[model samples]
Target: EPIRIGVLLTLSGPQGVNGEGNLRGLTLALDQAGMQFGGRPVELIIEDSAGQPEQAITKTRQLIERDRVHLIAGITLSNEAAAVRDILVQAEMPTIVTNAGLQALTRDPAMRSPYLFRVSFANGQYDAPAADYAYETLGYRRMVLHAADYAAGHEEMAAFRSRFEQAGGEIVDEVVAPIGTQDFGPYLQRIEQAAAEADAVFAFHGTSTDAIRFLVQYQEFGLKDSIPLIPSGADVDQSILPEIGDAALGLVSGTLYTAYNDTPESQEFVEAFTARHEGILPGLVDYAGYIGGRVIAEALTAIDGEVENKEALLEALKAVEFTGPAGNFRFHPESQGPVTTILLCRVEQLDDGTYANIVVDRIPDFDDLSF
Candidate 1:
């Protein structure tokens, strides 16, 4: 019998670009494993939520009731994860959270489920360290915050504020736009003016064209050189850097993975990924999906593909450990979320006229509670 896994991702709508990356990584992992775990074939039931919470709930319920999948993966947004949490927990379904970074889903007692494991990150995981980089290393005494106004964005901005303020830096202003907002003109205007008191701009956008739009506009408005753009890495993901072109140069970001990383694990992963995608580089969500797939495969192999006893499978999931593209991969026993290394990357155009995130610093052992 095949081991059935249900995957929920935002495949279309505003943030749809991330779905392609996630799917690529996930498929690459299973392909590497020969589409089998411990001698059993794998069956994936993939669904798209279009970034809607209500849709996520329905898809989750359908996956449990209709598909009867052994486990699930590939949640792409924070609200979608929150919406389907109880459904998954009530079903006792083991879930590998692929990309959603809502902190409370794993951190809050009420929301935490033994069945839910996050291989991605907590919303604040990168921002906490990024705040330190901004203040101490970059000497940014004052900053303006901007992000897509939603759960992940709010939490990321909050984390940055807490750490930035703790380091004696003031956040001069905060500006948020809806997740699917088209024109950032008004928001950019506000940020441009408020940035007068801010030494730099701290911003976060999802793996959507919002990143493309916002970044290009910032450069068009001539705010690029005046205010350095420091962002969560998703905004400048390698997959989209080509589209962003010169606008992305010199921008700094804090993230868990960089395609240019020099480790054997990473190099091999990048090589295969680029080969798989006709020379396209993997992005942040791609790494998230790859980790999610590897975690699932590792756990299933541990249990010899026996998923009938949900507890047994869940235990294997909790105990999964291996080396991945990002080096050591393991779940925090208590939080059920991964503790990963955060890389501070600066965007630079290579001699080949391609943009690359050059690794400048590393913050190791960064976890959900690192702040």
Candidate 2:
């Protein structure tokens, strides 16, 4: 019997383009694998949740009830992950988390299900490490924290704060913008006012339109040069890097992958992606898509494709080991996040005058990080 994989993403919203890239990654992997597992055909029930948790829950219900999917995967935003989490729990459906890096969805014991697994790192995984780099390596002492005013934003800032202050750095200022904010003038003013006091700014906006808009406005407000704006990997996706152009240079942050990485896996992944998308560059989330699809394929093969009942399938997914564009990969002991390298980089303009994420540091197998 064919297995149904319910792939949910924010396919139409401020984050829609990222959702498109993520979907491409998922599809490309499945296509390359001949779209079969143990000789049983795989059917993808892709849904667009539009970045709303409630919408995600509704679509999830449809996928599980109407479509009778055997597995669930591919969420982009954290709020949507939380909203639909209980549904997945009640169904006991085996889910592969490709991108939504929210901590609480998996860390909160009461909310976590035995069947959930993530192929991506949590927001804190990089933010906590990035904070250490900011204080210890960059010599930043009095820094500022900024992010979108939402749960995910709070988590990223909280993680960085815990790590940075513990390393003796002070958070001189904190600023936030409402969800889906278009005009960043009010928030940018606050960061500007404290520019003289703060050594640098650490920020986290979503991997969406606001992140792009915020970066552009941060430069437009003339703060980019005066205050080095740093963000988590999520806030500086390569998908939008080209669009940001020279405004991207000198931006400091930590990330998982850069399209420029020359590893054998990354080279193969990028080549396949470019060929698939007619020369479009694969973004960070696209890597997640490929990794998630590979995880799904591996789990299916491990269980002999008899996954309508998720007991063994769930265990196989948790135990599944793999690697990809980001390098070494596997779920943590508890299936919470990845035990992989945290690539630290700063945006710089090379001699070619082309802006790129120059890998400056590497954190070995980020773990022991807290919410």
Candidate 3:
């Protein structure tokens, strides 16, 4: 009998690109691992969430009830992870959440499930350090925040504002743009007015295309050079960095992972990923899916193909730690892990006439987590 793993991701819709990338990473890991554990073949039952919460819940129930998968994993968006967390808890099924970073997913007492564990670091878990660095180290005293008008947007904005203000920074304005909105003029105008009294701006936007468009337009509005922009993880990583070209130069952003990490594991993963994706850099979500699956594989191997004992499997997962492309990661006591270094990266123009973002500073700890 083969051990079954359930995978739910946004196979279609606005986040489909990320979903596909995640799938590719997982598949590569599976291939490298030889797709077997404890004399049983590893089987993956995949479903498309389509980036909807309702769909995620439906698919999760289907996988549990019909497929009878031993473990469930892979979710891209924050809301979808929250929905799946509910269903998995009810089923008491061991689950590994793949890339949704909203803090509420694991923090909410009502939603926190015993059998649920996240392999990726929560946005809030790492945002505090970034916010502190911005206010304390970067000397950004007054700032404004702008994010997508969704659960992820609200959560990240709140996290950044809470920490930034606690570190003696004043927030002048907070703005939200409807998810998938193309025109950023209205939001840009609000940010421009806020920028007059602010020393810097902090933003949280998803989807590389939208971020690139907004960054370019922000430059055209004459606000780019005047006030520094520091974006949260969503808007600032490999996903949009290569696409933003000159517009991204001099911008500061915070993130959990970067292509410049240069660790042995990170270098190998990057090389393999670039080779497969035509030199395109894999985003945090891609690495999350790959590493999450790899960790699950290790736990499955330890359990010796036993799906009947959910408790045993969950405990195995809690004890499992592995070195991945993002470095070594393990589950914290809260069942969530710290897979990030909490970096503040500065975007600079490379000699090749392309933009290069390099980490300027690193936040060493997430233990105290006080402001």
Candidate with best lDDT = 1
Residue 239 of model 3: what lDDT?
69
* Residue 31 miss distance in model 3 (angstroms): 2.6
lDDT of 3 by residue, 1-371 (tens): 88889999898987898888778878777767788877889899999999999999999999999999888888888878866776787788887877777676666656666787777666655555677877777888888888877776777778888898888888888988887678889899888888788888877777566777788887887778787887666666676777776777877776666777657887888888888889887777777778777777778778886766777887888788776665566666663554345666777776776566577776644531243
How high a TM-score does candidate 2 get? 0.91
List RMSD in Å for every model shown. Answer: 2.1, 2.3, 2.4
Q: Considering only N, C-alpha and C atoms within 3 Å, which residue pairs clash in candidate 3? A: none
Off by over 4 Å in 2: 180-186, 350-353
TM-score (all chains, Cα) for each model: 0.92, 0.91, 0.91
Tell me the tens digit of each residue's lDDT in model 1 across 266-344: 9999999999888877878889889988888788888888877788898888888887876687888888988777888
Q: List candidate 1 segments past 4 Å from native.
A: 178-186
Q: Cα deviation in Å at residue 108, candidate 3?
A: 1.2
Q: Cα deviation of 370 in candidate 2 (Å)?
A: 3.5
Candidates 1 and 2 compared: the better one by TM-score is 1
lDDT of each: 0.86, 0.80, 0.76
